[PDB]
Amino acid sequence: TRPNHTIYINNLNEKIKKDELKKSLHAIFSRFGQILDILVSRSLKMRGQAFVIFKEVSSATNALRSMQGFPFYDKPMRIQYAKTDSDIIAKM
RNA sequence: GGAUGGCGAAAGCCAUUUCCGCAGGCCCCAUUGCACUCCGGGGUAUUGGCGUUAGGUGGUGGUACGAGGUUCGAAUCCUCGUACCGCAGCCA
Ligand SMILES: [K+]
Ligand SMILES: [Mg+2]
Ligand SMILES: [Mg+2]
Ligand SMILES: [Mg+2]
Ligand SMILES: [Mg+2]
Ligand SMILES: [Mg+2]
Ligand SMILES: [Mg+2]
Ligand SMILES: [Mg+2]
Ligand SMILES: [Mg+2]
């Protein structure tokens, strides 16, 4: 557990189309602090996972302790910090 | 794409097709995966469109050619249109 600007989320319902997932994720997470970006992919290795990048590490960390396990589409979210800064954060 | 026919030396472009295929509907298998350019696979439906970067309307930049205007005349500047290309969305 090494605090990062980006929370990593897996165990997401894989049926949900992309656009919808982002929309829903943004509604739930944008209320923990300002969000800079949400990355969703439905590649063989990326599906079921989502990368939410807050603007301040204090937000990401708060979202984590709070949304951990939260129902989402009949599936508990499993959240963690992202093993590595996100492209936009690092350049900055 | 294959085949067949048309102009061609090919490139290509056109056409046809109860050959194969693509996006869109609907099901099924597989994946618990730490990424930032994308990207598993299969069955069935399969009109129309397209042809592996594989559908469409209208829209924004571009490339191409055309028209009107600019001008003495323009290959310049201006706008309009069309074909295509990367693009966002929406629809299939
Ligand atoms: K045919
Ligand atoms: Mg052929
Ligand atoms: Mg021929
Ligand atoms: Mg001939
Ligand atoms: Mg041909
Ligand atoms: Mg299909
Ligand atoms: Mg298929
Ligand atoms: Mg002229
Ligand atoms: Mg004149």
A22-CA/B67-C1' distance, Å: 47
Helix A57-67 vs helix A18-29: crossing angle, to nearest 10: 100
A40-CA/B61-C1' distance, Å: 27
Domain A1-91 superfamily per CATH: RRM (RNA recognition motif) domain (3.30.70.330)
Q: DSSP assignment, residue A90?
A: H
End-to-end CA distance of chain A: 22
Cα–Cα distance between A28 and A22 in angstroms, integer?
Answer: 10
For chain A, give every domain's residue range: 1-91
Cα–Cα distance between A75 and A42 in angstroms, integer?
Answer: 17
Write out which nucleotides of chain B lie closer than 7 A to a protein Cβ: 30-40, 90
Resolution (A): 2.8
Cα–Cα distance between A83 and A21 in angstroms, integer?
Answer: 22
Technique that determined the structure: X-ray
Q: A36 in helix, strand or coil? A: strand
Is residue A83 exposed (0-12), middle (13-18) or buried (19+ Cβ within 10 Å)?
Answer: exposed
In chain A, count H helices and then E strands.
3, 4
Q: DSSP assignment, residue A26?
A: H
Tell how far the Cα of A36 is from the centroid of ligand 8, in angstroms. 49
Q: Give the E-state strand segments of chain A in sequence order.
A: 6-10, 35-40, 50-54, 78-81
Measuring CA to CA, how many Å separate A53 from each of A6, A37, A47, A74, A92?
A: 4, 5, 17, 24, 13
